[PDB]
Amino acid sequence: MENFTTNLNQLARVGGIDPLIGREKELERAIQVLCRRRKNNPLLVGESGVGKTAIAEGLAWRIVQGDVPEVMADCTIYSLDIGSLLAGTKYRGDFEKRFKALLKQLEQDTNSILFIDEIHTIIGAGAASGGQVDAANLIKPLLSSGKIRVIGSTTYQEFSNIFEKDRALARRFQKIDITEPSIEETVQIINGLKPKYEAHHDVRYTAKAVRAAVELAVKYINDRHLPDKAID
Amino acid sequence: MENFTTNLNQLARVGGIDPLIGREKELERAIQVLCRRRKNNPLLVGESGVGKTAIAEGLAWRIVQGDVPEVMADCTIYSLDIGSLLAGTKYRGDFEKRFKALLKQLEQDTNSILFIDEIHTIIGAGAASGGQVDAANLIKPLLSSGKIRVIGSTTYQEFSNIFEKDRALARRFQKIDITEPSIEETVQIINGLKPKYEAHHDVRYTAKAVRAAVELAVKYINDRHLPDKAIDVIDEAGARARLMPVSKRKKTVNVADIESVVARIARIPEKSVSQSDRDTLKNLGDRLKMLVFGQDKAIEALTEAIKMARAGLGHEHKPVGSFLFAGPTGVGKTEVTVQLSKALGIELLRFDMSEYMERHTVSRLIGAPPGYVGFDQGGLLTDAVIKHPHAVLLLDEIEKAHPDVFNILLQVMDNGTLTDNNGRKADFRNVVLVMTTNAGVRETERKSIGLIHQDNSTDAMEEIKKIFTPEFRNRLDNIIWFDHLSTDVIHQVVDKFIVELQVQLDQKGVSLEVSQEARNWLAEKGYDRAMGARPMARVIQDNLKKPLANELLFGSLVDGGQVTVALDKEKNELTYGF
Amino acid sequence: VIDEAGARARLMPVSKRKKTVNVADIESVVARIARIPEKSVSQSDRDTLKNLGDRLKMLVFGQDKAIEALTEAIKMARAGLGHEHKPVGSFLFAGPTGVGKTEVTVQLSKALGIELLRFDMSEYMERHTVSRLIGAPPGYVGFDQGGLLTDAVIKHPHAVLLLDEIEKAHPDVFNILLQVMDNGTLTDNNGRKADFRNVVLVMTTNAGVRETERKSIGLIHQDNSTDAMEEIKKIFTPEFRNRLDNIIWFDHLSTDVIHQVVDKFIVELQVQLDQKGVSLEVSQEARNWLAEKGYDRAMGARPMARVIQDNLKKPLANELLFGSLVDGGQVTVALDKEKNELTYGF
Ligand SMILES: Nc1ncnc2c1ncn2[C@@H]1O[C@@H](COP(=O)(O)OP(=O)(O)OP(O)(O)=S)[C@H](O)[C@H]1O
Ligand SMILES: Nc1ncnc2c1ncn2[C@@H]1O[C@@H](COP(=O)(O)OP(=O)(O)OP(O)(O)=S)[C@H](O)[C@H]1O
Ligand SMILES: Nc1ncnc2c1ncn2[C@@H]1O[C@@H](COP(=O)(O)OP(=O)(O)OP(O)(O)=S)[C@H](O)[C@H]1O
Ligand SMILES: Nc1ncnc2c1ncn2[C@H]1O[C@@H](COP(=O)(O)OP(=O)(O)OP(O)(O)=S)[C@H](O)[C@H]1O
Structure with a gap:
């Protein structure tokens, strides 16, 4: 994992990620899933611009900031790349060897969670000739056995067409809906995120300006979800 | 086999395998298959989550416990990991150097049995700019010759799309069908497994909590199969309860906790009425009466249907209610529905029926058949009802849609379901269906000819009856005729x-x-x-x-x-x- | 079959009892391999069948004739006097609305302990929807999805198949059933065959409802059940109708x-x-x-x-x-x- 994943606690420690505001029920539902005896693997599913990663990274942030329970504290969440994981896997046997090594390192850690962001892609990495022997087929038994813990994430147009079809794989994840926040909730996250926009652009925002941005975006912009339409 | 397989008897001895409960017939057939002269290789085929894996490991467990006919005594079942088997095979001949070594050890032992989980994946090992000579080709000669015994495992789909395409390999396996268990069977499986969950979570489950988990999961979770769906309710309730002693809420798992967990999993309320949501329902009619004036019976019909569903005296499997609103223009038909969804805090799904003007447009609602251009789009209606399972569904001007589009609703109103082009079922048991129309209006607004004026008040119903087929009308909860405004x-x-x-x-x-x-x-x-x-x-x-x-x-x-x-x-x- | 029967007998004297292999052992083995009903003349199933008619009469009131048609077809086939290559029975139910047509079928599968496969024919209006049931030809996008009907009948070879409101499917859809009702088979897009010999097929219809609930003009009203028969005859081609075991007209409730x-x-x-x-x-x-x-x-x-x-x-x-x-x-x-x-x- 040394050259495949990112330690998200390390990013939280250096300010590499934005803070999470609210979403308490989204952070309480995921924690319970991770505590299960078997198949303790939450999957976050939602519409684009709902705030699914704000939840996934927000958890690594809270661990670093100490705002977790007595079961999450002192735990590491690693973010996995697929590109570097497969890059260079020429010669049959290299992909399986590399992947199994990653899985073993996680299995022997026992105190870490792997995060896969584009969870609608680990359904192939095998030989071009087939059959199977890909990242899904090589992971299923550890998810099943409760040996590793992963967090997934996907859209409603990616989990209904490419994730709701592999029945054995889908059975091993617990689906959590992430829904769109309302206006008051959006205003609050803007206030929470605001200091970084203010710093970046050397400006400060009028409190009224923040409310106006949220309400006007709701009234006039039709193809996006809040509060992603307000942040822009 | 040193770093390729796991000795399952060893795992059973140290407690790595959960016990089997039941499945005597499914296991007995496997034993008979393994005792055949040739091709004595059972294959376990079924839906996922039904114990296919549990049975294969379960046999290793029974052998360890001595609970076998003594033909199986002293057999060792090994589980093969394909992932380690191919990991180092970089050079030509390495894959044939490992595969043959394992086979010789098994053949020489003669008591051992090899278990290959997810067997459809052994149809590739070589791929080195060549072809054939893979794991399947190298196994075939031992299976038909009776030299080795293996146990397979696959789902029906994988077995119909992949495994069976190689007929020579397929004829060397003996398919056994493992079916999902019954209600009583599921309860017994949980009762025998619960000590593992109680130990893991430091909880205790009541007898009623176990039955509730099984019966509720069957009623509300339609995605999975037993026993696995019921087991998840129990395990999550356990995991949840273990995070309560943190505030010193040490407790057992009761029916009430099971009901809360199922309601969350299925995204549907049940025991959330004890809350002052009761207040929201209590004065729902008043809030709507302050927005729509007159038309009070319409308001009551809607609030009466909602309360019954919340009270618990609902329909076993039908929408919350299904109403046709009819009457003269500009009197609030659309308005009553719109304000209801706001008053209740739930999504309004709007469809405008004048869009479904022509007969073939129905595929727009449910999706194209396989083999057609829009196949990957899905249907607009079935998707909306999956995204939001608790909602108000409004079909405006249902008197402008194709005289055949009504036939879709027919099955929804009675059964609560609609199937899309991929076989997924939308579940309408938690939505309110409202259809609006001007169908009976033109006919009452007539000037009669003669010396004595006539009463045209029954004509509205005479026209609706001629539009909506009896099999449709007979399944509505009501028809609310709206008045003119005073x-x-x-x-x-x-x-x-x-x-x-x-x-x-x-x-x-x-x-x-x-x-x-x-x-x-x-x-x-x-x-x-x-x-x-x-x-x-x-x-x-x-x-x-x-x-x-x-x-x-x-x-x-x-x-x-x-x-x-x-x-x-x-x-x-x-x-x-x- | 010979070898499995042998293995089975080999595993008998574990209970001390030793055996030779008779026809009866061969029949048990074939029935197990083929996933079908064995000698049910000594199994608790004999009592289940004996009073099947009463369990259903306590749930659906009246319409005794429908219940009798269904239970005799089941006993007959189970008794061994079945068809050589046809479904257990093929019935069309018709009648006024609000009855137990769809309630006489659902309870049957429950009473027998077997899987109910339901299809809603109103979802097969367009003629090209046939591929939804049997699969896309090779070369097309849904090729690998399989068949809803063809696929369901394979997972469950012993079942009740219910096709609701069969008077709403595009008429070309009926031409699939012509093969099934007479031969017991249907071939899917991979060339695999469905086998319906252990399936009870029930179709329900509302053809003729509008007519039977109509009042005629005159001093004396008529029994319009005949009109419904006249309507059924115009929907279903003779080659279809002549393959049914029965058409059962359901009554009104008293x-x-x-x-x-x-x-x-x-x-x-x-x-x-x-x-x-x-x-x-x-x-x-x-x-x-x-x-x-x-x-x-x-x-x-x-x-x-x-x-x-x-x-x-x-x-x-x-x-x-x-x-x-x-x-x-x-x-x-x-x-x-x-x-x-x-x-x-x-
Ligand atoms: N409660 C919150 N606190 C802080 N940031 C939030 C919160 N909710 C959403 N955000 C998002 O913080 C930034 C990151 O959004 P994301 O979580 O990545 O959306 P997303 O759903 O993950 O995007 P995808 O998965 O690529 S569709 C965006 O500007 C906000 O939408
Ligand atoms: N008779 C039984 N006794 C005890 N547990 C059982 C029994 N039958 C099924 N199970 C459960 O089945 C386990 C889940 O995995 P399995 O269903 O055995 O594997 P599977 O059938 O091959 O499904 P996959 O791995 O998703 S394809 C649960 O942990 C078991 O409790
Ligand atoms: N009884 C009423 N009380 C308060 N406002 C009403 C009432 N009836 C009509 N309105 C007004 O008319 C609404 C326009 O929509 P609707 O009246 O609901 O249209 P409609 O009654 O459904 O008839 P159609 O669809 O035009 S034929 C305005 O939003 C309302 O303010
Ligand atoms: N004769 C009966 N005896 C006992 N229960 C019945 C009887 N008829 C109907 N039921 C019940 O079965 C429910 C379901 O509808 P069905 O009776 O099956 O009507 P149907 O056969 O489906 O024909 P349609 O679709 O209404 S035209 C009814 O709502 C119940 O009244």
């Missing part, structure tokens, strides 16, 4: 519209007041029985909004104050201010 | 039946209330009143449910939601004579 209502409507104007003005920072006579005048001026409230909006726009727009745009009202509208008597003209 | 139907619905209500901790008792007079208030010969039984919903369920919903009947209700319903109104409360 003049008393108009006064209430005028006040409503004036308030909306006052709000639009408050936003600009100016304030409007209208004397009572000015209001009475507007109300009388715009009344037209034939078109309900829509003309009142037009009269206000013409009399109050136009003057204001010019004062607001060409100074005067621009950043102004008090505008007072009053009626003179001489001309019946209105006054204005600042 | 008032004697309604009393039984009302009692049935009240029990369902009592069960829901017991779940809430509240028992319910209803006076016979109140019941007779509900039955008379709701009966309508023309709309079948569905209206009776509506009557119960307004007279008993609504009052209770308020007693349960804005009421102190939580975990304890014991309400009583009786009819007065003065207004014919019902009583309520603990």
Whole structure:
């Protein structure tokens, strides 16, 4: 994992990620899933611009900031790349060897969670000739056995067409809906995120300006979800 | 085999394998297959989550416990990991150097059995710019010769799309069908497994909690199969309860906790009424009566259906209710539905039936058949109902859709389901279905010919009956015929519209007041029985909004104050201010 | 078959008993391999079949003839006197609305302990939807999805297959059934064959409903059940009709039946209330009143449910939601004579 994943606690420690505001029920539902005896693997599913990663990274942030329970504290969440994981896997046997090594390192850690962001892609990495022997087929038994813990994430147009079809794989994840926040909730996250926009652009925002941005975006912009339409 | 397989007897000895409960027949057949002269290789095939894996490991467990016919005694079952088997095979001959070594050890032992989970994946090992000579080709000669024994495992889909394509390999396995267990069987499986969960979570489950988990999961979770769906309810309730002692809420897992967990998993409420949501329901009718004037029976029908569903005295498997609203234009048919979804805090799914004008447009709602261009789109209706399972579904002007599009609703209203083009089922048991129409109106608005006037009041129903087939009508909860608005209502409507104007003005920072006579005048001026409230909006726009727009745009009202509208008597003209 | 029978016999003297292999052992083995019903003349199934007709008569009231047609087909086939290559039986049910046509089939699969496969024919309007049932040809996008019908009949070879409102599918869809009803098979897009020899096929229809509920012009009214037969004949081609085992015309419900139907619905209500901790008792007079208030010969039984919903369920919903009947209700319903109104409360 040394050259495949990112330690998200390390990013939280250096300010590499934005803070999470609210979403308490989204952070309480995921924690319970991770505590299960078997198949303790939450999957976050939602519409684009709902705030699914704000939840996934927000958890690594809270661990670093100490705002977790007595079961999450002192735990590491690693973010996995697929590109570097497969890059260079020429010669049959290299992909399986590399992947199994990653899985073993996680299995022997026992105190870490792997995060896969584009969870609608680990359904192939095998030989071009087939059959199977890909990242899904090589992971299923550890998810099943409760040996590793992963967090997934996907859209409603990616989990209904490419994730709701592999029945054995889908059975091993617990689906959590992430829904769109309302206006008051959006205003609050803007206030929470605001200091970084203010710093970046050397400006400060009028409190009224923040409310106006949220309400006007709701009234006039039709193809996006809040509060992603307000942040822009 | 040293780093390729796991000795399952060893795992059973150290507690790595959960025990089997039941499945005597499924296991007995496997034993008979393994005792055949040739091709003595059972294959376990079924839906996922039914114990296919549990049975294969379960046998290793029974051998360890000595609970076998003594033909199986002293057999060792090894589990093969394909992932380690191929990991180092970089050079030509390495894959054949490992595969053959393992086979010789198994053949020489003769008591061992190899278990290959997810067997459809052993149809590739070589791929080195060649072909064939893979794991399947190298196994075939031992299986048909009776030298080795293996146990397979696969789901029906994988077995119908992949495994069976190689007929020579397929004829070397003996398929056994493992079916999902019954209610009683599931309860017993959980009762025998619960000590593992109680130990893991430091919880204790009550007897009723176990039964509730099984019966509720069957009723609300339609995605999975037993026992696995019931086991998840139990395990999550356990995991949840273990995070309560943190606030010192040490407890057992009761039925109430099971009910809360199922409600969360299925995204449907149940024991969330004990909350002062009761208050929301209690005065739901009043909030709606303050928005829609008159048409009170329509309001009651909707609130009565909702309360029954919440009380618990609902329909076993039907939408919350299904109503047809019919009547003259501009009287609030659409308005009552829209305000309901807001009052309840739930999504309104709107479909406009004049879009489903032609017969073939029905595929727009449910999706194209396989082999067609829009196949990957899905249906618009079945998708909407999956995204939001608790909702108000409004189909406007259902008297403009294809005379055949009604046949889709027919099955929804009675059974609660609709199947899309991929076989997924939308579940409508938690939605409110409202359809609106002008179907009976044209017929009552007639002038009769003769000396004695006739009563045309029954014609509205005579026309609806001729439009909606009996098999459709007979499954509606009701038909609510809406009335024309009275003049008393108009006064209430005028006040409503004036308030909306006052709000639009408050936003600009100016304030409007209208004397009572000015209001009475507007109300009388715009009344037209034939078109309900829509003309009142037009009269206000013409009399109050136009003057204001010019004062607001060409100074005067621009950043102004008090505008007072009053009626003179001489001309019946209105006054204005600042 | 020979080798498995051998292995089976080899595993007999583990119970001491030694065996040779007779025809009976061969028959047991083949039935297991093929996933079909063995000697049910000595199995508890013999009693299950013996009184199958009564379990169904206690759930669907009246329409005895439909129940009899279904149970004889099952016993006959199970007895060994079956068809060489046809479904267990192929029936078309027709009649006025609001009956148990769709209720006479669902209960059958429950009574027998077997899987009900349901398809809604109203979802097969367009003619190209046939591929939805049997699969896309090679070269097309859904090729790898399989078949909903062809696929369902394989996972469950012993089942009840119900095709609802078969009078709403595009007519070309019926030409698939012509193969199944006569030969017992259907080939999917991978060349695999469905095998319907252990499937009971029931189709239900509303052809002719509009006509049977029509009043004629004249002094004397007619029995229009004949018109429905005339309508069925125009929808289903002769080559289809001549392959059915039966067409069963369901009757209207009489008032004697309604009393039984009302009692049935009240029990369902009592069960829901017991779940809430509240028992319910209803006076016979109140019941007779509900039955008379709701009966309508023309709309079948569905209206009776509506009557119960307004007279008993609504009052209770308020007693349960804005009421102190939580975990304890014991309400009583009786009819007065003065207004014919019902009583309520603990
Ligand atoms: N409660 C919150 N607190 C802080 N940031 C939030 C919160 N909710 C959403 N955000 C998002 O913070 C930034 C990151 O959004 P994301 O979580 O990545 O959306 P997303 O759903 O993950 O995007 P996808 O998965 O690519 S569709 C965006 O500007 C906000 O939408
Ligand atoms: N008779 C039984 N006794 C005890 N546990 C059982 C029994 N049958 C099924 N299970 C459960 O089945 C386990 C889940 O995995 P399995 O269903 O055995 O594997 P599977 O059938 O091959 O499904 P996959 O791995 O998703 S394809 C649960 O942990 C077991 O409790
Ligand atoms: N009884 C009423 N009480 C208050 N406002 C009403 C009433 N009836 C009509 N309106 C007004 O008319 C609404 C326009 O939509 P609807 O009246 O609901 O249209 P409709 O009655 O459904 O008839 P259609 O669809 O035009 S034929 C305005 O939003 C309402 O303010
Ligand atoms: N004769 C009966 N005996 C007992 N229960 C019945 C009877 N008829 C109907 N039911 C019940 O079965 C429910 C489901 O509808 P069905 O009776 O099966 O009507 P149907 O056969 O489906 O024909 P349609 O679709 O209404 S035209 C009814 O709502 C109940 O009243």
